[PDB]
Amino acid sequence: DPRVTEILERQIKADSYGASLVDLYGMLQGWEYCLAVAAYICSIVAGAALPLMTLIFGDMAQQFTDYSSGLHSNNQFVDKIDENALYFVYLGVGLLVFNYFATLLHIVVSEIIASRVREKFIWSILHQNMAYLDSLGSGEITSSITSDSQLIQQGVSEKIGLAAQSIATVVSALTVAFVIYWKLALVLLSVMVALILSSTPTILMLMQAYTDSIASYGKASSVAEEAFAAIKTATAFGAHEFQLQKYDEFILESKGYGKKKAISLALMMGSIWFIVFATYALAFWQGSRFMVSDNSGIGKILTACMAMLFGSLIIGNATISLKFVMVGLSAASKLFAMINREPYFDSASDAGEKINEFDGSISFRNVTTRYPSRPDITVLSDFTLDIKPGQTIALVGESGSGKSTVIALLERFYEYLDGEILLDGVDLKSLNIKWVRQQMALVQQEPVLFAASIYENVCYGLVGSKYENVTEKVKRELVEKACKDANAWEFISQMSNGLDTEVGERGLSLSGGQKQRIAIARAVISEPKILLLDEATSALDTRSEGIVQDALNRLSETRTTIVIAHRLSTIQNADLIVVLSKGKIVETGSHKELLKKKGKYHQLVQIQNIRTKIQLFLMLLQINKGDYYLLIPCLFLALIAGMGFPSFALLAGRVIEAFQVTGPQDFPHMRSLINKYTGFLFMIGCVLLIVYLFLTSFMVLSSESLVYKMRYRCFKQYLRQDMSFFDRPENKVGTLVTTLAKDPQDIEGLSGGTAAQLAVSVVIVVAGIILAVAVNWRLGLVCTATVPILLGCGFFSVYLLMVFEERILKDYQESASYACEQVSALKTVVSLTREVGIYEKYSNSIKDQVKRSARSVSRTTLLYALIQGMNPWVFALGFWYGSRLLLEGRATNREFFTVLMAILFGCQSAGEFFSYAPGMGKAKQAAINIRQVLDTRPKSIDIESEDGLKIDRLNLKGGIELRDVTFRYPTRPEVPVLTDLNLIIKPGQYVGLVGASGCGKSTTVGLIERFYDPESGQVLLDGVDIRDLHLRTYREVLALVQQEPVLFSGSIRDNIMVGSISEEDMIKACKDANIYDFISSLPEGFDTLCGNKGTMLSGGQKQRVAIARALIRNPRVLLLDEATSALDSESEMVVQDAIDKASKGRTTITIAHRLSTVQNCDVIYVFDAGRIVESGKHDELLQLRGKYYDLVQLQGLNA
């Protein structure tokens, strides 16, 4: 026991891992560490060289101020301005070169690292034991292959380079500010740190508001999950407003937290735009104060102030880059946990023996095993079977007996705790696992063909064989012989291309028989010694089964086969038959020897014989008409927030003019002017604080209101669709839930802080351009020509970063699809021992992809680096032209610096809107999606249409008539379910419908509830076609009890009152359903929460609750769609008692699986091929000795 539990856990145990940047960068080998080192050096250099514009700008400001005061001649002014302009040009060239190299090398390093990670992950997954792989499923592996490697790239991509660059920019800016002027640098740093630590509660408030909103929608998404999954019940009982209200009570909490988010974001914006203005004001004021004792200068004051603001305002890009780094370190932890986990079986290694001249004899001895998923159920107990070369065993039994476990043990998919399996006398636990899998040939129930030619598909079976490395000409002969031995040449030679025809997602689309015949050829081409047929023909049809069975019989006549069959008629010629029940060999023997024994095999063959006998702005603007009271003041607020910066420009120009001292004699006047202008600078820096607070608050409130409206209307629109909408493949529950989660949240990109920043940006740019033209027309025209350049650079930087982000996922699609295809089926790949070939092909593919992507990245990085280097060139040109104008007398120091601050610096602040450009693509795709969703309507079955006759309850009888009803499910329209059905149910009749699987009796409920409309026919209620009746009232007439009871989350009172057409009736119906006593037994009364398995009541109790729910409305037509199919025999008694009690006094249509429920029905209708075959009472159908007799005999035999 301590050993078997250890084995069953070590089979499935999954260790936890913590990945750091060391693990990611350890995939670089040899000369690829120089690439990473050079990338980081270039990033650091290009980040540290950026705050030198502050040095050159301060020097140029000092030169302009000194010349305007007449401290040097024209020639010296020209010389110094030219030299400083060249310094700008050199800085721009250096920024270009280093940005290019840093970005290119970072991207290349990320490509290399992720290629190594992908190779390692695929090599691990392909060699894990099948117990662990079945634990994860395919979804966990396919997701890890496609969207968890992209995150690992982004972690080590140019994002980490930008994070390092930004940290270097902060360090270099602080270093510049301290060296040039530590007195003012220290003062500014202290004040800014005090104003940043003070705004710490606001950041906590924002993060709490985001967490609360995410949690509240998480709860709301759960209500949507149940509503779409349980959509048949909701439509049948009209619980559309109930589920919509449940959703609304949770998407209103998100709006309340969005309010707090609005205040917090407004506070953060106001604090930032107050810190900047207070830093300018304090820098100028305290630099004028210090200057009367240091003679430092406006140049040094500007250098210090600009350096401090530079480093502080570069922090925001660093945070998103570090978020990107940390997101890719969480995925790295998962992938490295899945890589470093060592498998239970060492199938990768070459250890183990290899039997020479393997005859094929197998000898099981006392074999006992458990699956790791369920360590209490024993799926095989004391299995003993000695198989000789050439024999044909045939394991049979009921489902769950454990016949299929033998094949899993022989292929080393799972581990047998106790026993012994000997291949020609050699233990199975001491053999090379891949060799053992090569000696066998697993023909599975579902054939899996890979997207390749038929020749390649059949050649996949040659792995490890002696024919693996031979001439291609010989291989084609072998494939032809194998396809002829498998009865596959008849449809391959008839093909267009023949053996080279593509299959799978390309080329031709085969049938089940043809795919199974190609799988048989693939299995037989290797000349296996053991054949493992695992219900090969269980998934085929009557016509196609013959050819595949002939092929299998031809194959099994020589090899040591182990056939697992569900059609017992195909194994009559087996050399031995083993009957398994609950994991034990109940009896064994030949076909004749077992029939005479009157045993389990006889019952199985009897059952088999009996069965054989049988522009989008205006859209959202119109939707959010109610929020205008918030967006009308926002225009005025944005206009004021826009006048702000072009008045800081005027005051800054006047301050720079006031710093035109010629000696300590002019210091009192300079101090007076600096105080007078710094007062106004601080007053303006406080007005914009309030303006930004109000504007951002109002805009974020509007955005949250729009998101709430989108969610509410989208959920309301999903509930209006007919049942033909929800059974489409693209309207899955998990897809609709995801769409609700994403699109009403992505549409927020066209409102809120983004729209506020858009308005503020355009106003700021327009006001700055107008100010530059008005102050000096000769200087406001040239500097206007640079506004397109600066704005284009600011936009295209973000655009190219988006391009870099998207290339990561766009490039690795072919190889990811190939890997996901070969990982969708691990059992077939592992059976063929195709790990090595798949890994080689995948490794070659991604190695080629690295080189293919490096070139395109090198092409784009040139434009990115040029855009990065443009800015110092614009500065140089502007300063040179300004100096020339100021020499000619056509400009002034005040006018030049006012124009410069406004134009250049205003375009810098308004480029923050371009950081919201990535959202505007999502916010347009989501707008298109929401427009499509909000406009879709059901063709005829509209629950929210008020047209149609109303059913008068006084004259209602309850007569249902299906007149010549023909119906096909629109998802599968080639398979008719009901054909020319004629069925009349008299009022008060307890009609029961019975039949075999696929007869289509359950479609009667769908037609009566009007889930679907019949293609040709007429369903009538009291002589009125239900297509001409009011849908809500009509469905209020009917009631429905389903096979699997569904109870919505909430109290028992809420669930049972879902089917309330209009407190006494509730108690009366709860007593009539034999559930009132159980409810009274509960600690609370009808307030017990049975949601998400809150109390997990018994199936009988949940069915009785559903019966009471259907019974409150007092229906005229009670539909019981196999109510007692999933109930225990003890609870079935009370449930059937409740059903019989409820069936009195109303029309009752009872679809039945167990024929005992329909025993006392007034009329019984037998279904076959969608048409009524027999009809009448129980005794008459028994006397007719027809299909009903066969069904009751089958029920008796099944027991």
Ligand SMILES: COCC(CCO[C@H]1CC[C@@]2(C)C(=CC[C@H]3[C@@H]4C[C@@H]5O[C@]6(CC[C@@H](C)CO6)[C@@H](C)[C@@H]5[C@@]4(C)CC[C@@H]32)C1)COC
């Ligand atoms: C945007 O919303 C994203 C959302 C929720 C994230 O919550 C917040 C977590 C803190 C974070 C990263 C956020 C916004 C601005 C960020 C701040 C800007 C400020 O700038 C500085 C420097 C410059 C100074 C002038 C002001 O203060 C920093 C100290 C401040 C800052 C870097 C501190 C961290 C802030 C988002 C998650 O979405 C998946």
